[PDB]
Design a protein around this motif. Structure first.
Motif, PDB file in Angstrom:
ATOM      1  N   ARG D  17       5.213   0.715  -1.013  1.00 25.80           N
ATOM      2  CA  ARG D  17       5.235  -0.379  -0.087  1.00 25.80           C
ATOM      3  C   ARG D  17       3.882  -0.924  -0.391  1.00 25.80           C
ATOM      4  O   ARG D  17       2.899  -0.458  -0.758  1.00 25.80           O
ATOM      5  CB  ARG D  17       5.135   0.182   1.152  1.00 25.80           C
ATOM      6  N   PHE D  19       1.176  -4.608   0.454  1.00 22.84           N
ATOM      7  CA  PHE D  19       0.947  -5.414   1.766  1.00 22.84           C
ATOM      8  C   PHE D  19      -0.051  -6.323   1.054  1.00 22.84           C
ATOM      9  O   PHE D  19      -1.011  -6.034   0.190  1.00 22.84           O
ATOM     10  CB  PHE D  19       0.353  -4.799   2.747  1.00 22.84           C
ATOM     11  N   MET D  54      -4.442   1.277   1.272  1.00 22.94           N
ATOM     12  CA  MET D  54      -4.996   0.370   2.390  1.00 22.94           C
ATOM     13  C   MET D  54      -6.186   0.875   3.170  1.00 22.94           C
ATOM     14  O   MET D  54      -6.979  -0.147   3.424  1.00 22.94           O
ATOM     15  CB  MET D  54      -3.907   0.575   3.448  1.00 22.94           C
ATOM     16  N   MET D  58      -9.224  -1.808   2.950  1.00 25.09           N
ATOM     17  CA  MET D  58      -9.573  -2.243   4.183  1.00 25.09           C
ATOM     18  C   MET D  58     -11.401  -1.877   4.517  1.00 25.09           C
ATOM     19  O   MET D  58     -12.116  -2.575   4.917  1.00 25.09           O
ATOM     20  CB  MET D  58      -8.966  -1.537   5.515  1.00 25.09           C
ATOM     21  N   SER D  62     -14.237  -4.559   4.850  1.00 27.98           N
ATOM     22  CA  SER D  62     -15.131  -4.336   6.151  1.00 27.98           C
ATOM     23  C   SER D  62     -16.599  -4.323   5.642  1.00 27.98           C
ATOM     24  O   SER D  62     -17.449  -4.709   6.479  1.00 27.98           O
ATOM     25  CB  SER D  62     -14.462  -3.566   7.012  1.00 27.98           C
ATOM     26  N   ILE D  68     -10.513  -9.777   7.790  1.00 27.86           N
ATOM     27  CA  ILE D  68      -9.028  -9.571   7.388  1.00 27.86           C
ATOM     28  C   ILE D  68      -8.219 -10.429   8.324  1.00 27.86           C
ATOM     29  O   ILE D  68      -8.158 -10.399   9.644  1.00 27.86           O
ATOM     30  CB  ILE D  68      -8.464  -8.089   7.656  1.00 27.86           C
ATOM     31  N   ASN D  70      -5.192 -11.772   8.066  1.00 30.56           N
ATOM     32  CA  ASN D  70      -3.695 -11.575   8.151  1.00 30.56           C
ATOM     33  C   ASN D  70      -3.428 -10.427   7.075  1.00 30.56           C
ATOM     34  O   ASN D  70      -3.995 -10.273   6.035  1.00 30.56           O
ATOM     35  CB  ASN D  70      -2.725 -12.648   7.984  1.00 30.56           C
ATOM     36  N   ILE D  71      -2.271  -9.810   7.445  1.00 29.00           N
ATOM     37  CA  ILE D  71      -1.608  -8.719   6.621  1.00 29.00           C
ATOM     38  C   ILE D  71      -0.145  -8.909   6.491  1.00 29.00           C
ATOM     39  O   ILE D  71       0.436  -8.733   7.724  1.00 29.00           O
ATOM     40  CB  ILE D  71      -2.113  -7.397   6.913  1.00 29.00           C
ATOM     41  N   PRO D  73       3.942  -7.813   5.049  1.00 29.08           N
ATOM     42  CA  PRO D  73       4.578  -7.123   3.834  1.00 29.08           C
ATOM     43  C   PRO D  73       4.867  -7.626   2.808  1.00 29.08           C
ATOM     44  O   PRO D  73       5.117  -8.966   2.814  1.00 29.08           O
ATOM     45  CB  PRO D  73       5.643  -6.488   5.088  1.00 29.08           C
TER      46      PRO D  73
ATOM     47  N   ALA E  81      -1.328  10.831   9.956  1.00 28.61           N
ATOM     48  CA  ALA E  81      -1.828   9.431   9.954  1.00 28.61           C
ATOM     49  C   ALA E  81      -2.167   9.016  11.290  1.00 28.61           C
ATOM     50  O   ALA E  81      -3.375   8.482  11.600  1.00 28.61           O
ATOM     51  CB  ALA E  81      -1.014   8.294   9.035  1.00 28.61           C
ATOM     52  N   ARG E 108     -15.991  -3.049  11.283  1.00 33.16           N
ATOM     53  CA  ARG E 108     -15.411  -1.984  10.300  1.00 33.16           C
ATOM     54  C   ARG E 108     -14.212  -1.121  10.903  1.00 33.16           C
ATOM     55  O   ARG E 108     -13.491  -0.395   9.837  1.00 33.16           O
ATOM     56  CB  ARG E 108     -16.814  -0.989  10.159  1.00 33.16           C
ATOM     57  N   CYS E 109     -13.831  -1.176  11.907  1.00 37.90           N
ATOM     58  CA  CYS E 109     -12.694  -0.478  12.571  1.00 37.90           C
ATOM     59  C   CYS E 109     -11.494  -1.368  12.818  1.00 37.90           C
ATOM     60  O   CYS E 109     -10.543  -1.217  12.450  1.00 37.90           O
ATOM     61  CB  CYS E 109     -13.119   0.488  13.585  1.00 37.90           C
ATOM     62  N   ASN E 111     -11.401  -4.672  12.538  1.00 37.54           N
ATOM     63  CA  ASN E 111     -11.192  -5.681  11.607  1.00 37.54           C
ATOM     64  C   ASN E 111      -9.975  -5.791  11.317  1.00 37.54           C
ATOM     65  O   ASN E 111      -9.531  -4.616  10.147  1.00 37.54           O
ATOM     66  CB  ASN E 111     -12.424  -5.857  10.724  1.00 37.54           C
ATOM     67  N   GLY E 112      -8.870  -6.534  11.407  1.00 38.03           N
ATOM     68  CA  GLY E 112      -7.551  -6.480  10.661  1.00 38.03           C
ATOM     69  C   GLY E 112      -6.584  -5.249  11.221  1.00 38.03           C
ATOM     70  O   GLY E 112      -5.683  -5.065  10.711  1.00 38.03           O
ATOM     71  N   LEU E 113      -6.964  -4.358  12.175  1.00 36.09           N
ATOM     72  CA  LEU E 113      -6.111  -3.216  12.626  1.00 36.09           C
ATOM     73  C   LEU E 113      -4.831  -3.702  13.313  1.00 36.09           C
ATOM     74  O   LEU E 113      -4.053  -3.094  13.006  1.00 36.09           O
ATOM     75  CB  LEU E 113      -7.200  -2.389  13.564  1.00 36.09           C
ATOM     76  N   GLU E 115      -3.374  -6.391  12.649  1.00 36.70           N
ATOM     77  CA  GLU E 115      -2.335  -6.929  11.731  1.00 36.70           C
ATOM     78  C   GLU E 115      -2.070  -5.919  10.754  1.00 36.70           C
ATOM     79  O   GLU E 115      -0.712  -5.887  10.458  1.00 36.70           O
ATOM     80  CB  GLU E 115      -3.123  -7.780  10.706  1.00 36.70           C
ATOM     81  N   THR E 116      -2.765  -4.689  10.622  1.00 37.98           N
ATOM     82  CA  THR E 116      -2.135  -3.682   9.811  1.00 37.98           C
ATOM     83  C   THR E 116      -1.038  -2.780  10.701  1.00 37.98           C
ATOM     84  O   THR E 116      -0.257  -2.557  10.105  1.00 37.98           O
ATOM     85  CB  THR E 116      -3.491  -2.673   9.732  1.00 37.98           C
ATOM     86  N   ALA E 119       2.325  -4.967  10.507  1.00 38.05           N
ATOM     87  CA  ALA E 119       2.913  -4.902   8.973  1.00 38.05           C
ATOM     88  C   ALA E 119       3.422  -3.612   8.779  1.00 38.05           C
ATOM     89  O   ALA E 119       4.487  -3.627   8.162  1.00 38.05           O
ATOM     90  CB  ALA E 119       1.729  -5.230   8.090  1.00 38.05           C
ATOM     91  N   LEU E 120       2.869  -2.580   9.289  1.00 31.90           N
ATOM     92  CA  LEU E 120       3.282  -1.447   9.174  1.00 31.90           C
ATOM     93  C   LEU E 120       4.558  -0.978  10.141  1.00 31.90           C
ATOM     94  O   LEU E 120       5.130  -0.104   9.870  1.00 31.90           O
ATOM     95  CB  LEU E 120       2.349  -0.117   9.370  1.00 31.90           C
TER      96      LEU E 120
END
Ligand SMILES: *[C@@H](C)[C@H]1/C(=C/c2[nH]c(/C=C3N=C(/C=C4\NC(=O)C(CC)=C4C)C(C)=C\3CCC(=O)O)c(CCC(=O)O)c2C)NC(=O)[C@@H]1C
Ligand SMILES: *[C@@H](C)[C@H]1/C(=C/c2[nH]c(/C=C3N=C(/C=C4\NC(=O)C(CC)=C4C)C(C)=C\3CCC(=O)O)c(CCC(=O)O)c2C)NC(=O)[C@@H]1C
Ligand SMILES: *[C@@H](C)[C@H]1/C(=C/c2[nH]c(/C=C3N=C(/C=C4\NC(=O)C(CC)=C4C)C(C)=C\3CCC(=O)O)c(CCC(=O)O)c2C)NC(=O)[C@@H]1C
Ligand SMILES: *[C@@H](C)[C@H]1/C(=C/c2[nH]c(/C=C3N=C(/C=C4\NC(=O)C(CC)=C4C)C(C)=C\3CCC(=O)O)c(CCC(=O)O)c2C)NC(=O)[C@@H]1C
Ligand SMILES: *[C@H](C)[C@H]1/C(=C/c2[nH]c(/C=C3N=C(/C=C4\NC(=O)C(CC)=C4C)C(C)=C\3CCC(=O)O)c(CCC(=O)O)c2C)NC(=O)[C@@H]1C
Ligand SMILES: *[C@H](C)[C@H]1/C(=C/c2[nH]c(/C=C3N=C(/C=C4\NC(=O)C(CC)=C4C)C(C)=C\3CCC(=O)O)c(CCC(=O)O)c2C)NC(=O)[C@@H]1C
Ligand SMILES: *[C@H](C)[C@H]1/C(=C/c2[nH]c(/C=C3N=C(/C=C4\NC(=O)C(CC)=C4C)C(C)=C\3CCC(=O)O)c(CCC(=O)O)c2C)NC(=O)[C@@H]1C
Ligand SMILES: *[C@H](C)[C@H]1/C(=C/c2[nH]c(/C=C3N=C(/C=C4\NC(=O)C(CC)=C4C)C(C)=C\3CCC(=O)O)c(CCC(=O)O)c2C)NC(=O)[C@@H]1C
Ligand SMILES: *[C@H](C)[C@H]1/C(=C/c2[nH]c(/C=C3N=C(/C=C4\NC(=O)C(CC)=C4C)C(C)=C\3CCC(=O)O)c(CCC(=O)O)c2C)NC(=O)[C@@H]1C
Ligand SMILES: *[C@H](C)[C@H]1/C(=C/c2[nH]c(/C=C3N=C(/C=C4\NC(=O)C(CC)=C4C)C(C)=C\3CCC(=O)O)c(CCC(=O)O)c2C)NC(=O)[C@@H]1C
Ligand SMILES: *[C@H](C)[C@H]1/C(=C/c2[nH]c(/C=C3N=C(/C=C4\NC(=O)C(CC)=C4C)C(C)=C\3CCC(=O)O)c(CCC(=O)O)c2C)NC(=O)[C@@H]1C
Ligand SMILES: *[C@H](C)[C@H]1/C(=C/c2[nH]c(/C=C3N=C(/C=C4\NC(=O)C(CC)=C4C)C(C)=C\3CCC(=O)O)c(CCC(=O)O)c2C)NC(=O)[C@@H]1C
Lengths: 162, 172, 266, 74, 172, 162, 162, 172, 172
Positions: D17, D19, D54, D58, D62, D68, D70-71, D73, E81, E108-109, E111-113, E115-116, E119-120
């Motif tokens: 996968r 991204f 990832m 990330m 950071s 970030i 956007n992410i 697929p 996970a 640091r945590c 940020n973009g979580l 979106e992660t 996406a997942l």
């Protein structure tokens, strides 16, 4: 080995910098703590025999099968009881090192790195040692900053096994 | 890397022993000296640029072959490298002073420094003379009685001299 | 380093190397140059056969689908890299090859070996290779767009001095390659946290005069010796002997039970 | 394109996968003071990341002050 | 990142101003809460494994769709996970508590979580539910009056809860 | 921005570690220091205009040509004197930030990084600012830990300029 | 997932190579094995309940404290007994996938990767599962190639747990 | 990637079910076809260079604009890139045939290829035409009754044709 | 990148034709101007520091908000970066002048620059103004009639002015 003094230099060195007020403050923090740690080490050391014996007994009480079942990983014979008391003695002794060092470094270097593989290879339950560490937490009779720092290292081990 | 506390710890573990009463009391004594240690580190650091440039000037005045054309500290690139090295050594000396143990200085800075200078053709004896010069200035700075709570820093001063000596011995 | 030292040490070409960066809107020539530089660096300057080139990864880089760092990683994970440096090498030789190829330096301490042996035992080859390329050291020196280059001959922030001396063990000259597996020259000095004299370029040379025998050649034997005869003053010794006396010297060392660590022409 | 190379050799469903991270605001900070290469773009830069890396990318972004935004697929 | 002190500094420098007496006094009041702040950090850390696992057990009991075959936390890899993420979020919440500023958590945590997880296909709302259960367990740990000098920690506890709320909102 | 608290978290984060006794000790060392730093910050602020004006004049006395020579980089006219007082004000204000923060972070972020390029570009002598910072060390009237921490930051700036 | 066919292609793809005789032989090796694997899968599937029930009881017999001790990690209540049967069912079902796929791929992907963390976090003894897996080896009733492949996957899991 | 076997496993796992008797029997039927599958992979692979080269000549003959100056297949690099792309697609079709599942072809070759060609200016329709020519020659090669144990390979030939059609449809 | 020559070649190749006689003559006229082009590159280069520092000084005097606390060029790192950008732009302007084609400036300097500044909060309009001041001083330096063989450089000056205008527009 993580300790305040080695972490300070490692950080300064990785930055290519002389030590500054930030690192001096780290040293002052170490000094404020050191005497209480040393006293904690002494108090634990003096009581070690009783602490280790009580911890092993506590584990056997909580997990009676360990003293009843045959097998190399159990304590149904004197061989196993000696191994068990030895291991618990290791945990206590290395915890005293952390109090002297002022950091988990000794636990990281000597005990925690690799313990998961050992416990799996030799089929030792991590829950056994958790119970031992609980016992030491309850029965070491420290107070104040000595109790807090000692408990932090005991909880660090408990968390690594959990 | 070791500090004064972990050096003792590591030896104890190799013996499978708790720290003895006297070892803990010796560590208590080290704790009692901590403030002097911090002051020494702070003082050398605060005077770092002068210690290096003064020791550098004096070295080149005594040893003009270093800065003569064709000399090893001649040209901007090599002069800059040489000044950088003096600061590097001084920096690691302060690290050893701060930790109370030589490991940081030995493992990271001194080990392989002789082979490095021999390989490069840097005169180690000259480097040793520079280190000696930084040594004397630093101790004078550490020992200055003005603007500081009065006390006896003889032990710490000896320790710091020791680290400087390690560096002087290492580079030749 | 500067000419005066670099000339003696055989590293002038390393000193004058310029980091190669893949820019936005690069030409086809610039991509080609970058691909060549990556192959030279990551494959340790082997002659690369056309059958061994990563056709697809090259296409993706050229299409700007993947970064230079991605392409370095594609090559490091390839079967070519494995066959050259992994399948026929012991682990510690493999690890120092990864440090040379991917970070452009020599290992600093035994714990680096231990870390990477553990990682290989835990996550296998891919996890081992990714540790180098994903490391802070890789990202801060080369980022995503700069081809890795050898760094060991220059003072790096947060290096150990012995990194410089050790560089000469893993970098043997411009016209060399990591092609023959073999053992690491660094094993003992890593394990014991020591350094070894640098004999590279023309620093191995020693004066002959009239004392170098019929061929006018001296050989430098480096030994580790103990007192098992005359008193031994040093645990580490060097002997300079002519060709004619070389067999006698070996036999002497052998009879004393002392270990030969290196021999070379002087 | 890129998945063929980005996804490693794990031959796992999870690792197969990729991204596309959109990152912006990469600028000079104390975190990359020593970095030996120049930042070329502070606008939107897109980074293809396999699932298995990832966490690392990330953390790298950071730690470098990037945002970030956007992410997607692959 | 910023801590409580440097947050104020950055704002003052943008205005080109020295810190006022009120700002210095407020930061002095921050220093006076320091020991309570350290205690809260220490208490959460010493119970990290229990906070996570208990929160995770309760989550999966409340939301069995997550662990049944095909669920997002089904299979060992995904379960691990999931537990890892819970531990990560708690770790960064303790970081924010320790620094007294939210920046480390946000930069640091979080940020973009969001979106992660989109996406997942991680259900971000279930993550938020998990974070809430860790918040509730953590605050009781911090508030425990046993074995500690008695005093009012309601201010620090409120600050901690906001860090948990910020994490929960960031995913939900 | 280097301070004890951020550096402590930075280090633990790079190791993927919860905070341990080592980082808590860093916090105590900060707490031991903070009040003296805040008091030092207040004293410097209240005396700022006096310190800045005096330091400026000390530079003019030590380097008289800076008030006599024409050119953009000099303080022969009011434009240049204003610039010069502004610069010295920046050093003093940022130094107060360092005392508040508890580390060189603010000096590193706002002033030190890139200072060489500015001074070379606009032909400003570092020696001018060293003299200004020396004046401030000699006239801030601090004592004890306030003086020690404040002089470290002033010396830090001096060393960066030397 | 790791199976003979995907690994063949994965290797070939990394080399940018068409499939060659080496890969064809791998395919033939898969064909030699497939029917026995499919037969083993059906046999395990048909007796799944009996195997799972039997295996769960085998664990209880060997580790009686699991059905006697109160705790989230034990099977003293109906909740735990159901968790346990589910878990053993997972091992059994995924093992049948391995027989269908012709490799450990399914075990690696769905169960083994991360199992160390699960067992540590939830305080589940891997010795429990080893015993369940041994029971299944002793009672699945396979023979010949079907038996050899099934036991290799059961042992693969057993080795992973110890 | 999936093969024919693990495609069914992954679906079964997502439902938490054992494969049914119907599914196992279907897989057993696939096994019976294995020799034909292997022969077809071998035959395409043995003729890969001719399939590509003949397909390309036929494509440039029908579409001479591709190979005139300024055309997308003009200059050696573009022509070589074009021939490479044809061989890559054929290679991935043989992977899909070998595995009995389209995922390797789709995940690695086709997914995103349309968008990539659009950005490059590569005419996706012309690529599809070339894929068609390779498909036609490849299927004839598989069907050649000479030199092989006679039998009905219609099922395997239909599958291979489907893989070519996926490839053609993914570019245009 | 392209130069004035390869720009013509590349267009010719896409059409599959030899350069016309008038295209060759035009390039000959370009060659006749080569010495003036070299002089202009040398003159701008020789004065680069002055050009940058004077324009920057002029800009901040005209736009004091930039350097007030909180302004974009406030703090040494931001001022340093601002000065660097001025020099980068000037450097790439000379590259374009040297090659006789804008492609280098557009591809390696200006591409993405507006987005960079927007993301950073750099005022692009202020950048364009600084580029205008650099343009002005550069053209005066290039036209300085002293110490140089006399001739008409208006064509080269126009070409240079275009590159500056290109840079200013790309940011503003
Ligand atoms: C809310 C968090 C709870 C609470 C906290 C609380 N703590 C103190 C005082 C102290 N706590 C410490 C902590 C430590 N000492 C150590 O050596 C270490 C190990 C590294 C730690 C974590 C210290 C040093 C003090 C100061 C000395 C003292 O014991 O008083 C207080 C008292 C007020 C103060 O801020 O000093 C309080 C209120 N108390 C509660 O009731 C809450 C459950
Ligand atoms: C030899 C080193 C010289 C010397 C030192 C000395 N210092 C003290 C005591 C203290 N020094 C400090 C230092 C600092 N306080 C701060 O806030 C900072 C800035 C980060 C520093 C560096 C402190 C805290 C003390 C304790 C309080 C005090 O002011 O006394 C002593 C006294 C003994 C002790 O162990 O504390 C001594 C001897 N004195 C000399 O005469 C030498 C030239
Ligand atoms: C459609 C594909 C064509 C076709 C194929 C076909 N092949 C067989 C049988 C076999 N083919 C092989 C193949 C190989 N043996 C090897 O050693 C290698 C080289 C590495 C290969 C490629 C084998 C082993 C067999 C089985 C034994 C035999 O010789 O037959 C069949 C028969 C059915 C079967 O499933 O075996 C068929 C139909 N036949 C046609 O008519 C098509 C043109
Ligand atoms: C507008 C640009 C100004 C101008 C230019 C100009 N230059 C020449 C001629 C020459 N200039 C050079 C330059 C150099 N010679 C060197 O050795 C180097 C150092 C590396 C340089 C930069 C040369 C070689 C020539 C040719 C010989 C000559 O001196 O004439 C001209 C004359 C026409 C021509 O194209 O050669 C001109 C016009 N003249 C002006 O008045 C503008 C201010
Ligand atoms: C003359 C314009 C002004 C001046 C000069 C001055 N220089 C120094 C000291 C040094 N000068 C250099 C320069 C170089 N060394 C090199 O190798 C090269 C490259 C080929 C150069 C350009 C260096 C390195 C030094 C320091 C070491 C040394 O002494 O050689 C001094 C003395 C400084 C000191 O502290 O000793 C002086 C006086 N001073 C003026 O006032 C003039 C206007
Ligand atoms: C100055 C007193 C003398 C001098 C110095 C000199 N050193 C070098 C080169 C190097 N110095 C080092 C040392 C270190 N690098 C590190 O990272 C560390 C700390 C961990 C140390 C101690 C190294 C590795 C080098 C070589 C690589 C490099 O130059 O960056 C030079 C340059 C030699 C040359 O030819 O370039 C010089 C001049 N020279 C003198 O004459 C003084 C006696
Ligand atoms: C041909 C006349 C003789 C011969 C040659 C031969 N050489 C190698 C291998 C290598 N040759 C080099 C040399 C260089 N590489 C460079 O980059 C440079 C320029 C800076 C030189 C001079 C290297 C480094 C290698 C090893 C790397 C590699 O082989 O890829 C071989 C191959 C040996 C082998 O395959 O093991 C051969 C055959 N051999 C003869 O018999 C001729 C006398
Ligand atoms: C648990 C309560 C829930 C859950 C979690 C879950 N997360 C992932 C995957 C990832 N989570 C992250 C997040 C982070 N990684 C970091 O390093 C940090 C910052 C320091 C964060 C916040 C990432 C990046 C991933 C992907 C990369 C990786 O997992 O290694 C999964 C796996 C999803 C998958 O398909 O594999 C899961 C299961 N899932 C639930 O159902 C719970 C509600
Ligand atoms: C005073 C000791 C002497 C002096 C000062 C002087 N400075 C400038 C110009 C600048 N000063 C700075 C410095 C800073 N800007 C910052 O943002 C910070 C960090 C927070 C610092 C330290 C800068 C960047 C400039 C240039 C831009 C600007 O003018 O603001 C001048 C004028 C230089 C010019 O060419 O205009 C002067 C006069 N000059 C003396 O003679 C005094 C002894
Ligand atoms: C049975 C041998 C013993 C036993 C079992 C038991 N297990 C749990 C909880 C869990 N079991 C798993 C295992 C898996 N989840 C998966 O997705 C897979 C891969 C397909 C496996 C192998 C997990 C992850 C959990 C925790 C999450 C969940 O509950 O679903 C429990 C309960 C533990 C708890 O704290 O709730 C029990 C009781 N216990 C015994 O005493 C038996 C001997
Ligand atoms: C030939 C029938 C047609 C044609 C092809 C053509 N393609 C490109 C460029 C690229 N093709 C790809 C595709 C892939 N690369 C891979 O690694 C894989 C597997 C993952 C695929 C599917 C890529 C990435 C590129 C761009 C990068 C590169 O050039 O290698 C070109 C070149 C176009 C150009 O150079 O501008 C051409 C000519 N063109 C036609 O006209 C035919 C219809
Ligand atoms: C000065 C006239 C104005 C100004 C400038 C300014 N720029 C930045 C930061 C960056 N500038 C660039 C631009 C480039 N980098 C390149 O490599 C190239 C192409 C070769 C260009 C054109 C970039 C990428 C950055 C960010 C990364 C870096 O700074 O290195 C800043 C700093 C922004 C910040 O927040 O730090 C500034 C101040 N600012 C003004 O106010 C003037 C109008």
């Amino acid at each position: 080995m993580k300790t305040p003094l080695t972490e300070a230099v490692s950080t300064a060195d990785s930055q290519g910098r002389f030590l500054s007020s930030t690192e001096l403050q780290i040293a002052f923090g170490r000094l404020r703590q050191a005497n209480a740690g040393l006293q904690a080490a002494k108090a634990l050391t003096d009581n070690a025999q009783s602490l280790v014996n009580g911890a092993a007994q506590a584990v056997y009480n909580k997990f009676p099968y360990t003293t009843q079942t045959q097998g190399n990983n159990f304590a149904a014979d004197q061989r196993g009881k000696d191994k068990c008391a030895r291991d618990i003695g290791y945990y206590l002794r290395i915890v005293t090192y952390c109090l002297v060092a002022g950091g988990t470094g000794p636990l990281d270097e000597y005990l925690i790195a690799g313990i998961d593989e050992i416990n799996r290879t030799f089929d030792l339950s991590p829950s056994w040692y958790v119970e031992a560490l609980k016992y030491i937490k309850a029965n070491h009779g420290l107070s104040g900053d000595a109790r807090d720092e000692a408990n932090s290292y005991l909880d660090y081990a408990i968390n690594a096994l959990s | 890397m070791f500090d004064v506390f972990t050096r003792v710890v590591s030896q104890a573990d190799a013996r499978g022993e708790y720290l003895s009463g006297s070892q803990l009391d010796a560590l208590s004594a080290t704790v009692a000296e901590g403030n002097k240690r911090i002051d020494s580190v702070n003082r050398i650091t605060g005077n770092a640029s002068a210690i290096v440039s003064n020791a550098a000037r004096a070295l080149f005045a005594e040893q003009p072959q270093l800065i003569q054309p064709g000399g090893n500290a001649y040209t901007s690139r090599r002069m800059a490298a040489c000044l950088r090295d003096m600061e590097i050594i001084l920096r690691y000396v302060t690290y050893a002073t701060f930790t109370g143990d030589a490991s940081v200085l030995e493992d990271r800075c001194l080990n392989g420094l002789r082979e490095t200078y021999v390989a490069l053709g840097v005169p180690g004896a000259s480097v040793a003379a520079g280190v000696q010069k930084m040594k004397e200035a630093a101790l004078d700075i550490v020992n200055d009685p003005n603007g500081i709570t009065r006390g006896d820093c003889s032990a710490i001063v000896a320790e710091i001299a020791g680290y400087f000596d390690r560096a002087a011995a290492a580079v030749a | 380093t500067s000419l005066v030292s670099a000339q003696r040490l055989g590293i002038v070409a390393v000193d004058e190397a310029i980091p190669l960066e893949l820019r936005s809107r690069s030409t086809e020539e610039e991509v080609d140059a970058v691909i060549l530089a990556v192959y030279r660096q990551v494959l340790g300057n082997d002659h690369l056969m056309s059958q061994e080139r990563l056709t697809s990864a090259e296409s993706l880089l050229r299409g700007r689908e993947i970064s230079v760092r991605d392409f370095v990683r594609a090559v490091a994970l390839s079967e070519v890299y494995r066959q050259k440096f992994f399948h026929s090498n012991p682990q510690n030789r493999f690890i120092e090859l990864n440090y040379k190829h991917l970070l452009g330096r020599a290992p600093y301490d035994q714990s680096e070996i231990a870390f990477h042996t553990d990682l290989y035992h835990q996550g296998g080859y891919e996890a081992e290779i990714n540790s180098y390329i994903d490391s802070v050291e890789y990202t801060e020196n080369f980022g995503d767009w700069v081809v890795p280059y050898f760094r060991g001959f220059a003072t790096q922030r947060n290096q150990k001095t012995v990194g410089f001396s050790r560089s000469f063990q893993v970098y043997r000259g411009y016209a060399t390659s990591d092609r023959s597996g073999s053992r690491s020259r660094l094993t003992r000095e890593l394990a014991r946290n020591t350094a070894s004299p640098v004999y590279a370029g023309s620093t191995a040379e020693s004066l002959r005069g009239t004392s170098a025998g019929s061929r006018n050649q001296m050989y430098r034997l480096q030994v580790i010796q103990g007192a098992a005869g005359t008193r031994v003053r040093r645990g580490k010794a060097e002997y300079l002997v002519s060709y004619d006396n070389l067999s006698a010297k070996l036999q002497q060392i052998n009879r004393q039970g002392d270990t030969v660590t290196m021999i070379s022409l002087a | 394109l890129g998945q063929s190379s980005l996804v490693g050799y794990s031959n796992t469903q999870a690792a197969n996968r990729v991204f596309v991270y959109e990152v912006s605001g990469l600028r000079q900070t104390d975190a990359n003071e020593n970095s030996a290469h120049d930042i070329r773009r502070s606008g939107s830069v897109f980074i293809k990341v396999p699932y298995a890396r990832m966490n690392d990318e990330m953390r790298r972004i950071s730690r470098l002050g990037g945002t970030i935004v956007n992410i997607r697929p692959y």
